[PDB]
Amino acid sequence: MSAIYKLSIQGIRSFDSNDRETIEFGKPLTLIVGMNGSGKTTIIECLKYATTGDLPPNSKGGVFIHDPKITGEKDIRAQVKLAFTSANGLNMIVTRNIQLLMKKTTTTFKTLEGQLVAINNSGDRSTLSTRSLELDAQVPLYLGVPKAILEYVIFCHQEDSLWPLSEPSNLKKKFDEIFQAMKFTKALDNLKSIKKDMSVDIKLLKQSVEHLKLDKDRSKAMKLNIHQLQTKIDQYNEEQNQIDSLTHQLRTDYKDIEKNYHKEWVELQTRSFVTDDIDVYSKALDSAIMKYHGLKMQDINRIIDELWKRTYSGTDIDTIKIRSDSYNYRVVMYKQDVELDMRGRCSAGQKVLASIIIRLALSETFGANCGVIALDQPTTNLDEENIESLAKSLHNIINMRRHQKNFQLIVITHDEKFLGHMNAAAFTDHFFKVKRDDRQKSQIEWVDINRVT
Amino acid sequence: MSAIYKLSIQGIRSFDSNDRETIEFGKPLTLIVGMNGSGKTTIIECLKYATTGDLPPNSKGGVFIHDPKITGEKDIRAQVKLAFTSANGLNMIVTRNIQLLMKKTTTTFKTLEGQLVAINNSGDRSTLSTRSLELDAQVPLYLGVPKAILEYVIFCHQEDSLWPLSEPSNLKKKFDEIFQAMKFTKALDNLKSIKKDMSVDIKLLKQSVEHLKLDKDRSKAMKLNIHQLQTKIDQYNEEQNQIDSLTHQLRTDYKDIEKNYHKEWVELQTRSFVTDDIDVYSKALDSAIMKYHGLKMQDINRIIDELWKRTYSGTDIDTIKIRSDEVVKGKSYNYRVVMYKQDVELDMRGRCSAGQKVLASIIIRLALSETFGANCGVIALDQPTTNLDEENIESLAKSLHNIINMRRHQKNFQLIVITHDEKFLGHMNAAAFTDHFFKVKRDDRQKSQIEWVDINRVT
Amino acid sequence: MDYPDPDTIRILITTDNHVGYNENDPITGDDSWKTFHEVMMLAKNNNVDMVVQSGDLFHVNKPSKKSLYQVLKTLRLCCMGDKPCELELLSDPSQVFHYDEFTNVNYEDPNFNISIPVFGISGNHDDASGDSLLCPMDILHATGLINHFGKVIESDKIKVVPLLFQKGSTKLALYGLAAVRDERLFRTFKDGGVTFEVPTMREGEWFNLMCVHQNHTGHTNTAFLPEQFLPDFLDMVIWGHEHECIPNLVHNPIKNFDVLQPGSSVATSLCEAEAQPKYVFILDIKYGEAPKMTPIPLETIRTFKMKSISLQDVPHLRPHDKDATSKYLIEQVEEMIRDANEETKQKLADDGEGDMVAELPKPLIRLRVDYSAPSNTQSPIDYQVENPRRFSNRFVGRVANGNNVVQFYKKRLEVQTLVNDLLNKMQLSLLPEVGLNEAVKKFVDKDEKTALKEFISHEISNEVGILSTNEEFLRT
Amino acid sequence: MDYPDPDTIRILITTDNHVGYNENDPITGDDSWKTFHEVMMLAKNNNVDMVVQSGDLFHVNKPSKKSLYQVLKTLRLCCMGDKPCELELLSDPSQVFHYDEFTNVNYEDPNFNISIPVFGISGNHDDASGDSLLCPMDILHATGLINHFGKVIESDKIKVVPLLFQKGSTKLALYGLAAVRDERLFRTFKDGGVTFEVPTMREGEWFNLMCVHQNHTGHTNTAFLPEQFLPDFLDMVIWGHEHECIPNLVHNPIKNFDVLQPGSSVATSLCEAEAQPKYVFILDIKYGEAPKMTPIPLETIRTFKMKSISLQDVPHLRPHDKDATSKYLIEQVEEMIRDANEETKQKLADDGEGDMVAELPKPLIRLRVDYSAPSNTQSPIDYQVENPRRFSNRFVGRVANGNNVVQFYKKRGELEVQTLVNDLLNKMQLSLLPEVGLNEAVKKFVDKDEKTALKEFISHEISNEVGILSTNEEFLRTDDAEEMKALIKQVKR
DNA sequence: AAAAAAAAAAAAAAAAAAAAAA
DNA sequence: TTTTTTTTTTTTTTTTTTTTTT
Ligand SMILES: Nc1ncnc2c1ncn2[C@@H]1O[C@H](COP(=O)(O)OP(=O)(O)OP(=O)(O)O)[C@@H](O)[C@H]1O
Ligand SMILES: Nc1ncnc2c1ncn2[C@@H]1O[C@H](COP(=O)(O)OP(=O)(O)OP(=O)(O)O)[C@@H](O)[C@H]1O
Ligand SMILES: [Mg+2]
Ligand SMILES: [Mg+2]
Ligand SMILES: [Mn+2]
Ligand SMILES: [Mn+2]
Ligand SMILES: [Mn+2]
Ligand SMILES: [Mn+2]
C-alpha cells in the first residue's frame, strides 16, 4: 500500500526561501516536537499541498509563501517536494513550484508547472505529468485515497480539526466528497443555475404579457367598428373615410398581433413547465444522494462506536454515531438509550475526542489503501484520563494496523505526558525538532529519542 | 470597585434540577479543576448569565437547561443566584429564574421573573427590580462596567476566546459596544433600513413615470388632429363626427393627464434627492464613529504593547497592535490586529500559529480588563494554556503573578482560573494566594457537584 | 530456613516489582511497595547471601517521592546489619561499576554495614533518561544500599563483564545485561556485537548466571531476543520483563542451560498471564551437585480472578436488547466476586488465622466480554452493551477494580445505479425522463460541462414548436 | 581552619542552596550542585562539628534524578569518615524526629559511619506536598545522610522541640521551624499558638539557636513574620528564604539575640538582591565568651553584574526611533561585560593561577532599562525598543544568560453625543435636508430612545417639500440638473 | 387564553476578487 | 487579452422569545 518517505520544504511560510529543509517519515510512528511558531503545522500544510494541491485556509494574499516584506527581495520562489510509494508499490516523486512576484503596488501569486515522475528500480526517471491541474488528480489516484480523505481525514488542518461537529451544510459538503458523490451534487447545482436565469426571464415575460394584452385589446375593437361602418354604408347604397383611417391604424400599429402574441404565450407556457421539472428532478435526484449517504454511513458508525467505547474514559455517554436525516446532518450522542444532538450540548474535551475518533474511524474505512494519518496536537482540552486512554488506543491501532502493509502515524505535540503512555521509544529511535535559527528561519533537526523529556 | 462573592447553580446544564451547588470566589485567586464533562465552563456560563443575562452560544433548543428527555419530567425550572457587591460598596443579590415546559414533542423555553435585592447593613431586603430586561441594565450598572465587557472580556466563553482574531466586521461589532458607540451604529442601521424602502419606491415611480410618458406622448396628437379638422370645417363654411369621436376619447381616456404625470416626475426627483441626502450624512456619521474607535483604543494599545513584551518568549514578533482604519469594495472596515516582526507590519490573522493567536487573545483581554474594566476587577480565564509551549506557559504564569501583585495594591481584584494541567499550577504559585480550590465532579447519578478541598491535595 | 552450608551461595531472585504502580489508587495504592517489602523481608530472615533483581524495580522512569522513600525504607531495614557477608569479590569491581567513583560493591565500603548486598539491572521502564542519562538505580547506588550493574554505554558494541564471587570453594560469575530495545539488540547480536569475557583463570568450576530483561517471544517478526543468541557457557538465565510466573525451569537442550522466568510481584495489567500465582525463587549453588531451587509464594498479592466470555457463544441472548445482556453480565461478575472472596478467606484461614473472620481486602476482578455479532446474522448492529465505566461502577465497595471490571472487545450502486431506479417515479409533464437521466449521465461521466442546460433548452424549443403549431392550444 | 577546642561546637551555616535551578541550561546547568559540593567541602576540611541548613536545599518540590544524585554523591563523600563525632545527645531523638522508625540521629546509628552530621529544616520550595506529605528531605533522612528536623504536622498548633547537644562543657539547643505560609504562621503566632519546649535542667547555660525560613520583612502590610513574635531566650536566629547575603550579625536590642541572614549559594533571579557577595558562615560556640563568626566567600559563583538605568534620564534619545537607543543599550551592555570579565580574571588569577590563562567562565549580565515616556511629552508612544530575547541573543558566546540580558519595564459615554460629529454635521453640506433638524433628528433618536424619530423626519421631507416644489411651475420646464441645483440653493439662502 | 409585531441568533446564500484555463 | 472557479466576507431569511396590549 501507499506510504510517504520524504518531504523537502523550501520558502514556504516560516521557512527560508534559499534553503531546503528535509524531514523523513518512518514506520510506524513519526514524532515532531517544537516550540510555538516553529513550523510544525507548516509541515502538514506542505504535505497536504503536495498530495492534493490546495493551500491552507485564509491564505488569500499569498501568505503561504515566505513573506517578501521580511526578506526584502521581489521574486520569491517556493518548492514543496515529496517522495512516496504508490499503492501498487511503484516509487514516485512529486514537485510543486509557486511564485510570489511583487510589483510596486500589488503582489501577484501564480503557480508554476510542477512535476511527477515514477522512478523505477534502476533510476529510470520518466515524467508522468507536468501541469498542476493533472497533478492534483494523479497523486490522490496513485495513493489510493480520494482527494477529500487526504485533506479532511489524513492531513487535516489544526484550525479545522473539529469539522465533524460543524454546521449541517458543512458536514454534508464534506461527506459528499468523501463518498465520491460530488459529481451529482454539482449536477444539481447546475440544474439550479437553469432555474435561476429562467426565473428572471419568466419575470420579464410576465411584464410583456401585460403589454401584449393591451395591444390585443387594441385590434378587435377597430375591426368591429369597421364592420359596423361597412354595413351602415351597405344600407345607404340600398337607399367611408372613418373606415380608411381605422384600416390604416390596423395596418401600421396592430398588424401581426394574433400570432406574435401567440408565440409569446407559447414561450410563457414553456417556461412554466421548465420550472416544475427542474425542481421535481432536483428533489428526486437529491433524495437518492441522501439515501446513498445514509447507506454508506453504516460501516463508519460501526467502527466509530467500537473506538469510542474503549477511548472515552467517562460514565455519561454510552456511544456516538453520525446520522443523516436543510440536511438534518449531525452526530448524536447516547446517554443511556436516549439520543441527543452533540453540538451545542457538549464540552471542549468531548468535542475534541469525538473529532479524533471520527477521523480515526474514517481513516481505516476509506484510507484502507493509504495507512497514513497526521494528528496535530491531539491532546488539547483533554484531561489526564482521556490523554492516557487516547494514547493506549493509538498504541492498539498501531498494533492492529501493522499486519497490514503499513501504518504511518505522524504525531505533533509539545505536551510531554502524552508521549509516555504511547511508548514513543518503543516504536522509534529518534524524532524531529523544529526550531528557528538566529536569522528567524525554521530548521528541522534529527534528535535521539532518549533526549526528549 | 465591585466584587463577586458566591454563586449557586440549580438546574443548569449538567447540574441537578432538584438540588443546588454553590461556589465562593476568593480573593485574589480562584481555582476550579475537574475532568472532561464536569461543569467547569458551566460555572462561567452561569456567572455571565447572572451578570449580563444572555445564554451561551448555540443554545436555541433550550439546551442551557437540564434536559427533561433524560429525567422524565415535563415542567422543569432552573435558577442562578449571584451575591456580589456594588462598585460603591453595596451588598446585592441577583436571582434568575428559567422554565422549560415539555408538554408535547415541542419544548417551550421561558424566562420567569428574577429579582435584584440590595441588602443594607441591617438586612434590609428590598427588591429594587424584577423584570429581567431591567436586570440586564441594572446589574452591569451596579458592577460599574459596560455590558459588553462582561460578555467578551471578563466572563468570556471558551469557544469565543479567540474573538480578537476574527473577521473585521465581527471585530468592529465587539468593539462597538465596548466603546459604548453602539447607539450611533443603530442610527446608521436605521438610515440604511429606510434607504432600501425608498429605493423600492424609486423603482415603482420609474415604472409609473414610463406610463405617464406614454400618456404625454399621446392626447396632444388628438388635440392637434381636432384643431386640423376644425380649421378645415371653418374653410368649408367660408366656401364634424371625427372631432366628436376624438373629443369623447379625450374626455374619457386622456382627461387629467397634464398635471398628474408632472407631479409623478417630481416625486421621482424627490426620491433621487433623498438618496443623495441619506448617503451623504451616513458616510460621515461613520467617519465620525471610526475616528472614535481609533481614538479611544489608544491607551489599550499601550498595555498590549507592554504586556506582549514581558510575556511572549520568542524571537520573531516584536509587538502587536490593533488598527481600525477605513478602506477595495467588500471588506467593510479594516479592523484587525497587526504584528510587527522586526519593525515591519503584518496582519496577524492568517499567518500566525495556534499558540500565538491564543497568547494574543489572552493579552488583549487582559489589557481590555484594565482600562474599561477598572471599576470591576474580575477576570475569568478558562483554560489559558491551550497550544502554549513550556516557555509561554511559564511566562504567562509569571505575567499573571505580576498582574495580581500590581492590580491589588488598588481596590478589589479577582482572577478565576479554570484549568487541568500541572505546569501552569506549579509556575503560577497558586498556593501562595489561597488555601483551597474547588473541584467539580459528577456523582454516581451523573449530576455535577462542586467540592471544597485542600490546596495541598492537587498532586 | 537454616543457615546455608559455608560452601553454598544462596540467592533470592526477584524481578518486575514495579514499585509505584497505581500510586494514587485509593484502594490498591500501596500494593506494589508492600509486596516489595515482603520480598525483601523474605530474604532478611531467610539468610540469603545476596539477592539479584532483574530490572523494573520502579514502574516509572522518574520515581516519585513516596516510591523512592518506601524502597529506601525496606533497603535500610533489611540490608544493613552486623553479620558480615561471606562473599569475596574475586574480580575488579571498577570494570563493572564504571559509572562513577563508587567503583566497588557496597558491602566492601568501610562506611556501610551491609549483610545482604542487592544486585540489580535496569529495565524497560526505569531506564536511563535525561541530559546526563541517569537511571533510577543510579540514585540508589549512590545511596549505598544497592549496586547497579550491567549498564550499556554504547548500544551497538556491547561487552558484558561478569562479577566473580566465591564462597569457600563454590564460585559464581554473575553476568548482567540491561534492557535495551529488542530491534537494536537483535541487530547487534546478529553481527558479532555483544561479547562476553568469560574468566580465563581456572575455568570449569564457575556457575555462570545471567540476568536479562528482554521479550522471550515476540508477536512481530524481529522484536524479541532469541534464547539461542546467548553463550553456551552459561548455566542458567534469569529472564525478566515477562510478567507470567513459571515456578519450574525450562531446560534449554542444545545450549545446556535452564531458563528461569520469575514473573512479577505486582499485576500491572489484568490479563491471563497475571492471573497465575506469583512466586519468588531461592537458588542454592553448591559445587559438585545440582542447583536446587525453592519457590516461595508471595502472601501479599491481591486476589485476581479472570474470565473471558463471548456473548455470541451463549444462547437466549439477542443483540437488539440491552436490559437482558446487562442482567447476565451482572450475574457473571457476581459469581466470580464470590469465587475470589472465598479464595481470599480460605487463604487467610489457612495460615493459623482460622479462628477469626476479618474484613477481607477487595479482589481484582476482570471480565473480558466479546460483544461481536454472530456469523449467521448479517447485520451492522452487534450486541448492545452498557458503558464499561458505568457498568463497573455498580460494583464499587465490593471489588478493588474500581472502574474497569468489564472490558468489551470485538473478536477478529455508486449513485447512478440507485438513481436509475428512481427514474420511474419522477414524472415530469414536458421533459422526457430517458433523455434527462441520460442528459445528466452524460454530464456526469463524460465530463461535458454544457449538457443539462442544452438538453433542457433544446427540449423546450421542440415543445414550444409543437405547441405553437396547434392553433387550438392558444384559445384555451 | 584547624581542629577546634574540645569545648567548642563549630557549625557551618548555609541556606537556599536550590540544587536544581536552571537544571537544563547548557552553560549554567551545574552551578547549583557544584556550589553545594563546594560548601560541603568547605565543611569537610574546616573540621566543623555539624552543619545546619536552614531551608531550600532543592529548587523544586519533586527533585530530579540529577539533583538527587548529585546531592547524595556530595553527602556520601564528605559526611562519612572514620573519625567519630564528638557531639553528645542529651534529648530523646524520637521527640524531634517524629515521622518514621528512623528515630535517632544519623551519627549515632550502629550501621553508619557519619563523621559530620548535616541537619536541616524544609523550605518553601522543597516542602511537603504529596499523597502522604513527603518532602525531599524525608527521602534523604531515609538514606541516613541527613536528619530532617523541625517538621510541622498541623499548622494551627505548633510545638517546637529542640535538639540538645553537648560537647566538652558547652551545651547547644537547636530549635527549628519549617517553612509554612507566612500569612498563616502569622495568625498562629498571633494567638499564642506556638510553644517552645525549653530544657528543664540548668537554665542560663544553653546557646539557643533557631533556624527560621520566613519572610524577614514585608514590603506590603501582610507579607512576612516579625522578629517580635520570637521568644527572648534565643541567642541567635538564622534567617532563611532571604537571598540577600548580609555578612553581619544584626543585633536585636530588646529581644537580645543576633539575627543572621546567610543568603544563598546560587542566584535564582537576576536582580540586585543576588548581586551582593555570597558567603557561607562558620559559628564557634563556646561557653565563657561570645560566639565568633567567620564568613568565607564562595569561589564557584558565576560573576554577576547588575545595572539599572531609566531611559528617559539620558538626553539625545528620541523615543520615536528604535536604533539610536539600541546602539546605546548595546554599548552599555558591552561596557559592563568587560567589567565582569575583568573581575572574573582578577579573582581567578589571585588564588594561585597568576601564571596560567584559561577560558574565563561566561558572566551573568543583566541590564534593567526603563522605557517610560518622558514627563514632558504625554504622547501614548514611549521609547521604542526591540525584542528583549532577540536583543539579548546578540551576546551569545560572551554571556551566560543569552536570552535575558536586558529587561524592559515601566516606572509608574459616546464622546459627548455628536461632539465629534458636530464638525462633520457642519461640513455635511446636503442639498435638501436641513443639518440642524437632522443632527437633532438623530440626537433625539439616539438620545431619547425614540425608535422612529429619524424615520419620520426624513419622511416629512418627502411630503412637505414635494408639494412646496410642486408649487413652482418653472421647476417642471427645466431638464438641466445644474439649473435645478442653483434654484434649490437660491430658495435655501 | 388569544393575537400581533420586534429583537436576535444560526444556518444557508449571494457578491468581489484574484487565480487559472482559454 | 478575456472568461470560469474557489474562497472570504457580508448579508440576508426563519423561527423562537419577549413585549404590547387585555
Ligand atoms: N507567510 C509567512 N511569512 C513569514 N512568516 C510566516 C508566514 N506565515 C506564518 N509565518 C510565521 O511562521 C510561523 C508559522 O508556523 P506554524 O504556524 O506552523 O507554527 P506551529 O508549530 O504550528 O506553532 P503552534 O505550536 O503554535 O501550533 C508563525 O510563527 C508565523 O508568524
Ligand atoms: N443541556 C444539557 N443537559 C444535560 N446535560 C448537559 C447539557 N449540556 C451539556 N451537558 C453535559 O454536561 C457537561 C457540561 O459541560 P462543561 O462545559 O461543564 O464541561 P467542562 O467542565 O467545560 O469540561 P471540558 O471543558 O474539559 O470539556 C457537558 O459536557 C455535557 O456532557
Ligand atoms: Mg500548529
Ligand atoms: Mg469547559
Ligand atoms: Mn515489567
Ligand atoms: Mn519490563
Ligand atoms: Mn525559601
Ligand atoms: Mn530561596
Ligand nearest to the Cα of B388, by number: 1
Residues 6+ apart with CB under 8 A from D233: D196, D198, D208
Closest C-alpha to A133, from A175, A96, A92: A96
Describe the crossing of helices D136-143 and C65-78 by its angle, rounded to 10 degrees: 10
What phi and psi values does residue A124 have, to the nearest 5 degrees?
-90, 75
Structure resolution, Å: 3.2
Cell matching residue D251: 543585633
- Chain A 54-83, CB < 7 Å to strand F: 54, 57-60
Alpha-carbon gap, residue D265 to D296, rounded angstroms:
12
Peptide bond into A57 cis (omega under 30): no
Q: Using CA positions, which residue lies closest to atom 12 of ligand 2?
A: B14
Q: Is the CB of B136 under 7 A from strand E?
A: no
**Is the CATH number of domain A3-166+365-451 3.40.50.300?**
yes
Classify burial at D309, counting beta carbons within 10 Å of its beta carbon; exposed 0-12, middle 13-18, buried 19 or more: middle
* Whether residues D107 and D210 fall in one domain: yes
Assess A381–B contact: CB distance below 8 Å, yes or no. Answer: yes
| Plot region of C409 (φ>0 → left; ψ -120 to 50 → alpha; else → beta) | beta
CB contact under 8 A, C453 and A298: no
Q: What value, to the nearest 5°, has the Cα angle with vertex A246 and ends A245 and A252?
A: 90
Does one domain contain both D18 and D95?
A: yes
Examine the domain organization and report whether D29 and D146 are in the same domain. Answer: yes
CB of B53 within 7 Å of some strand F atom = no
How far is Cα C302 from Cα C306, in angstroms, rounded to an integer?
13
CA of A350, nearest ligand number: 2
What ranges in C191-293 are assigned the alpha helix state H? none
Asked if D475 and D469 touch (Cβ cutoff 8 Å), the reply is yes
Nucleotide nearest to B132 (CA to C1'): F18
Question: For C235, which DSSP code?
Answer: S
CB D304 within 8 A of CB D275: yes
Residues C131 and C193 in one domain: yes
Which of A336, A347, A382, A386 to probe ligand 2 with, by most ligand atoms within 8 A of CB? A347
Question: Which of chain B's residues 358-397 bind strand F, using a 7 Å CB cutoff?
Answer: none
Provide the H-helix boundaries in C252-407: 325-348, 388-391
C288 sits in the region (left: phi over 0; alpha: psi -120 to 50; else beta) called: left
B240 is in an annotated binding site: no
End-to-end CA distance of chain C: 120
Query: Counting atoms of ligand 2 from 1, which one is nearest the CA of A349?
Result: 27
Gap between the Cα atoms of C93 and C141, Å rounded: 14
User: Looking at strand E, which nucleotides approach a protein CB closer than 7 A?
Assistant: 7, 9-13, 15-21
Cell numbers that stand for D482 in this block = 445644474
What is the bridge-based pairing of β-strands D236-239 and D257-261?
A: parallel
- For F14, nearest residue by CA–C1' is A326
Phi then psi dihedrals of residue B102, to 5 deg: -125, 85
Catalytic choice (D37, D59, D98, D125): D125
Residues of B with Cβ-Cβ distance to D421 under 8 angstroms: 184, 284-285, 288
- Residue B69's CB: how many other CB atoms inside 10 A? 11
Q: Is the CB of B331 under 7 A from strand F?
A: yes
Residues lining ligand 1, CB < 6 A? A 13-14, 34, 36-42, 63, 65-67, 70; B 316, 351-356, 387
Q: Considering every ligand atom, which ligand is closest to the CA of B352?
A: 1
Domain that holds residue D152: 8-297
Residue C305 lies in a domain: no
* B446 with A316: Cβ contact below 8 A: yes
Residues of D in contact with B273 (CB under 8 A): 431-432
* Cα C400 to Cα B202: distance, rounded to the nearest angstrom: 82
Residue C234, domain member (yes or no): yes
Q: Verify whether the Cβ–Cβ distance D81 to C29 is below 8 Å.
A: no
> Which mutation among B10, B12, B14 tests ligand 2's pocket best, with the greatest number of atoms within 8 A of CB?
B14
At a CB cut-off of 8 Å and minimum separation 6, what does B376 contact? B1, B2, B87, B143, B144, B145, B149, B150, B154
Cα C382-C388-C394 angle, rounded to 5 deg: 130
Has residue D160 been placed in a domain?
Answer: yes
Q: Are residues D245 and D378 in the same domain?
A: no
Residue B127 CA, nucleotide E6 C1', distance (Å): 29
Co-location of D263 and D397 in the same domain: no
Judge whether residue A113 contacts strand E, using its CB and a 7 Å cut-off: no
Beta-sheet pairing, A372-376 with A408-412: parallel
Q: Does A349 touch chain B (CB under 8 A)?
A: yes
Write a three-state SS string for chain B: CEEEEEEEEECECCCCCCCCEEEECCCCCEEEEECCCCCHHHHHHHHHHHHCCCCCCCCCCCCCECCHHHHCCCEEEEEEEEEEECCCCCEEEEEEEEEEEECCCCEEEEECCCEEEECCCCCCCCEEECCHHHHHHHHHHHHCCCHHHHHHHHCCCCCCCCHHHCCHHHHHHHHHHHCCCHHHHHHHHHHHHHHHHHHHHHHHHHHHHHHHHHHHHCCHHHHHHHHHHHHHHHHHHHCCHHHHHHHHHHHHCCCCCHHHHHHHHHHHHHHHHHHHHHHHHHHHHCHHHHHHHHHHCCHHHHHHHHHHHCCCCCCCCCEEEEEEECCCCCCCCEEEEEEECCCCEEECCCCCCCCHHHHHHHHHHHHHHHHCCCCECEEEEECCCCCCCHHHHHHHHHHHHHHHHHHHCCCCCEEEEECCCHHHHHHHCHHHCCCEEEEEEECCCCCEEEEEEEHHHCC
CA distance A411 to A419: 10
List of chain D residues whose C-beta atoms are within 8 Å of the C-beta of residue C62: 64-65
What is the H or E stretch that residue C170 is in?
Answer: strand C170-176
Count of domains observed in chain C: 3
Dihedral sign from CA coordinates of B420, B423, B425, B431 = positive
For B286, name the nearest residue in chain D, comparing CA atoms only.
Answer: D421
Residue D173 and residue D233 in contact, taking contact as beta carbons nearer than 8 Å = no
| Amino acid residing at D154 | E
Is residue C272 located within the same domain as residue C334?
A: no
CA atoms within 13 A on the CB side of B259: 6
Buried b (16+ CB within 10 A) or exposed e, B290-313: bbbbeebbeebbbbbbbbbbbbbb
Angle between helices A132-143 and A40-51 (to 10 degrees): 100
Same domain as C326, residue C273: no
Cβ atoms within 10 Å of C372's Cβ, excluding its own? 18
Expressed in angstroms and rounded, the spacing between residue C185 Cα and the centre of ligand 6 is 15
Q: Tell me, letter by letter, the H, E, C secondary structure of chain D.
A: CCCCCCCEEEEEEECCCCECCCCCCCCCCCHHHHHHHHHHHHHHCCCCCEEEEECCCECCCCCCHHHHHHHHHHHHHCCECCCCCCCEECCCHHHHCCCCCCCCCHHHCCCECECCCECCECCCCCCCCCCCCCCHHHHHHHHCCECCCCCCCCCCCEEECCEEEEECCEEEEEEECCCCCHHHHHHHHHCCCEEECCCCCCCCCEEEEEEECCCCCCCCCCCCCCCCCCCCCCCEEEECCCCCCEEEEEEECCCCEEEEECCCCCCCCCCCHHHCCCEEEEEEEECCCCCCCCCEECCCCCCEEEEEEECCCCCCCCCCCCCCCHHHHHHHHHHHHHHHHHHHHHHHCCCCCCCCCCCCCCCEEEEEEECCCCCCCCCCCCCCCCCHHHHHHHHCCCCCCCCCCEEEECCCCCCCCCCCHHHHHHHHCCCCCCHHHHHHHHHHHHHCCCCCHHHHHHHHHCCHHHHHHHCCCCCCCCCCHHHHHHHHHHHHC
Check A315 against B387: CB less than 8 A apart: no
- Identify all chain C residues contacting A277, using CB atoms and an 8 Å cutoff: 428-431
User: Does a structural domain hold residue C178?
Assistant: yes
Catalytic residue among C37, C59, C98, C125: C125
Nearest Cα residue to atom 17 of ligand 1: B353
Using C1' positions and the CA of B350, the closest nucleotide is: F8
Fill in the DSSP letter of residue C448.
-
Instruction: Classify residue B319 as left (phi > 0), alpha (psi -120 to 50) or beta.
Output: beta
Q: Is the CB of B130 under 7 A from strand F?
A: no
- Assess contact for C337 and C365: CB atoms under 8 A: yes
Tell me which residue of B76, B70, B63 sits closest to B103, measured CA to CA. Answer: B76
For the record, the C-alpha cell of C167 comes out as 564462597
Q: Is C193 a member of any domain?
A: yes
Does the residue D351 lie in any domain? yes
Name residues with Cβ closer than 5 Å to ligand 5, which is an ion: C 16, 56
Residue ranges around ligand 2 (CB below 6 Å): A 316, 345-350, 381; B 13-14, 34, 36-42, 63, 66-67
Residue D463 lies in a domain: yes
What number of residues does chain C have?
476
B301 with D409: Cβ contact below 8 A:
no
Question: Both D256 and D148 in a single domain?
Answer: yes
Whole-number Å distance between alpha carbons of B123 and C169? 94
Ligand 1: centre distance to CA A348 (Å)? 24
Q: Please report, for the domain that includes residue D368, its CATH number.
A: 3.30.110.110
* Closest atom of ligand 1 relative to the A377 alpha carbon: 27
Give all chains having 3 or more CB-to-CB distances under 8 Å with chain C: A, D
Nucleic acid strand F within 7 Å of B109 CB: yes
F4 C1' – C457 CA distance, angstroms? 21
C-alpha D114/C-alpha D78 separation (Å) is: 9
| Residue among C286, C241, C232, C277 at smallest CA distance from C260 | C241
Chain centroid offset of residue A26 CA: 29
Question: Does C425 lie in the same domain as C289?
Answer: no
Q: Which amino acid is at D186?
A: F
D279 and D206 part of one domain: yes
In a domain, C474, yes or no: no
**Per-residue b/e over A346-363, b at no fewer than 16 CB within 10 Å?**
bbbbbbbbbbbbbbbbbb
Q: How far is D128 from chain C (nearest CA, A)?
A: 10
Q: Is D148 a catalytic residue?
A: no
B108 by Cβ neighbours in 10 Å (0-12 / 13-18 / 19+) ranks as exposed
Considering the domain architecture, whether residues C255 and C361 belong to the same structural domain is answered as: no
**Residue C143, min C-alpha distance to chain D (Å):** 6
Test the D interface: residue of A416, A438, A439 with most D CBs within 10 Å: A438
Q: How far is the CA of B60 from the C1' of F15 (A)?
A: 10
Experimental method: cryo-EM
The phi and psi torsions of B311 (rounded to 5 degrees) equal -125, -35
Interface of D with C in 159-198 (CB under 8 A): none
Ligand nearest to the Cα of B56, by number: 2
Alpha-carbon torsion, ordered D248, D253, D257, D262, to 10 deg: -20
From A41, A43, A76, A415, the mutation candidate for ligand 1 (largest count of ligand atoms within 8 A of CB) is: A41
Distance from the alpha carbon of residue C139 to the mean position of ligand 6, in angstroms: 19
